[PDB]
């Protein structure tokens, strides 16, 4: 029950601003070394900012003058203020508690920051109807959205084995697309109904799509 | 009769930075020329006073503070710096009048297995005031549960060792530091450069 | 001032094997290194600090060692869930922390043939004016596979996009989707849509096909 929960990521136009936040529990942020570390898509880790329990702050050269790390002791929360964002700040940002010589022991789940001129667009969800013996495959086509990420679960999470949600591919139009599939016993097509739940928070899109033969 | 700088600069053992030693220097003549004319100091930075004029000057009290840190921390022994040394171990005031002298001591303070005698404070809630010295070893509380003097999760011994090895990069090698502060008070001046004997 | 270089950049090994990953520092640091494990979609997980101390909760099969400039992480008896990117970190007691570039470790296993399925476009998407045809290759090893689209026996080039899953943490397999995208109008011009799959786990290629409107 030591956790760090990030929020505030999303799409922003280059030269705009964004503040991230990191609610902590199971230690006191004002009493700890705390860090932000970022990871550009498919790339390595890059330290961003450090704050001391005594109040001093320190920044990587690539963000100094634009980012500001801070905290709020009553809300036990860590902040990153980002100004004058550029395309190369696109990354998922992690907060982490630093035991400097004992390493970075607890990390947030991460939060994606996309800086881009492209407008947001919600997905269209289309069924991949099963074929019907033995085993059957079915799923959902999540087409034409921006930006990343989308979440897809099946039957509100009551179905996890056999599931493959593929990483999005950027299409020529500049929009993302993906499929989520699942394999099930052919007999269960008569027994179990199958709904894929698609959430695209940037566009406020919640879609439930029943997939039938 | 001369001020005992040899007792400070040439001491066999230096203090850990968190338990920095302070030597009060009074009632004596201080020849500073043996310092700024040495070439065996890699840092000799003065503030609010000129080197090459110290032999012409007088002061009420002189303090000689001395300790060991690693080379790339030396820049934190300066007014207005931040970092784990300036914040939690040894803090210079903004209006500091004096000199900071340092030199590489890898041949004296590194061990083959790593020297673990020299320490710094790593965990502390707030910054030190200038010239404050904190030698507490109380278990540091990083969370809401009291430690009751036992080391565990969120409950950390606050001091850590440098582990000086002769194969460290120069920025991570041990450096001996002497800080001279010059006290000019509303009292007689009992420390003078030789030109003012 | 400190750069950490990990080697090799990529590595594959079989379960039960012993695996060794190297981190080289440009200058002498001294046991001030940590190792992290990062699985896809997850935050890094501390495995080792001070170059050799096991973080609490980490399985005993992870061990580390080294001093100065040369460090190693070792997995004693590799397990399928160890598929990850491994990172070293300089544990600098002053700000400029720095990480290695990462070492992607993939699990080697026996050949497994893919199961192939084909999905016609839905009629709701045809109403939109576009048609996607999806070929699914399920739970195969190794990752290399060819997927060739044929439309009335004409090989298609330049209108399909592929996507592969990260290696599976239980059985070390991959899954792949290939999506062929056409306009409604062009989709209506042809009858036989097929997906031909080549893979070393298949003695001859496998075609799955459907006739539009059946
Ligand atoms: C620290 O000790 C050394 C002893 O080697 C002092 O330096 C020597 O002093 C004598 C007498 O003045 C000279 O003849 C030598 O040439 C000096 N050797 C050097 C400078 O390498 C040194 O002065 C002492 N430091 C202080 C502050 O007293």
Residue numbers in the entry:
A (entry chain H): 1 to 132, 137 to 217
B (entry chain R): 334 to 530
C (entry chain L): 1 to 22, 25 to 216
Article excerpt on this structure:
Fifteen of them are accumulated in the receptor-binding domain (RBD) which is a primary target of neutralizing antibodies produced after infection or vaccination, including nine mutations located in the receptor-binding motif (RBM), an RBD subdomain that interacts directly with the host receptor ACE27. Here, we analyzed broadly neutralizing antibodies isolated from long-term hospitalized convalescent patients of early SARS-CoV-2 strains.
To gain insight into how NCV2SG48 and NCV2SG53 neutralize broad variant spectrum, we determined the X-ray crystal structure of antigen-binding fragments (Fabs) in complex with the Wuhan S-RBD. We found that NCV2SG48 is a typical class 1 antibody, while NCV2SG53 recognizes a class 2 epitope. The X-ray crystallography revealed that NCV2SG48 and NCV2SG53 form multiple hydrogen bonds with RBD directly or indirectly via water molecules. Structure analysis suggests that SHM created five additional interaction sites which contribute to the extension of the binding interface with RBD covering the almost entire part of RBM including the conserved structure. Such an extremely large number of hydrogen bonds and binding interface well explain the stability of NCV2SG48 neutralizing potency to multiple mutations generated in variant RBDs. Germline reverted NCV2SG48 antibody substantially reduced neutralization activity to Alpha, Beta, Omicron BA.1, BA.2, BA.2.12.1, and BA.4/5 but the only minor reduction to Wuhan, D614G, and Delta variants indicating that the introduced SHMs play critical roles in acquiring broad neutralizing capacity against even unexposed variants. NCV2SG48 antibody was rearranged by IGHV3-53 and IGKV1-9, which combination was not detected in the isolated mAbs other than NCV2SG48 suggesting bnAbs may be preferentially derived from minor responders.
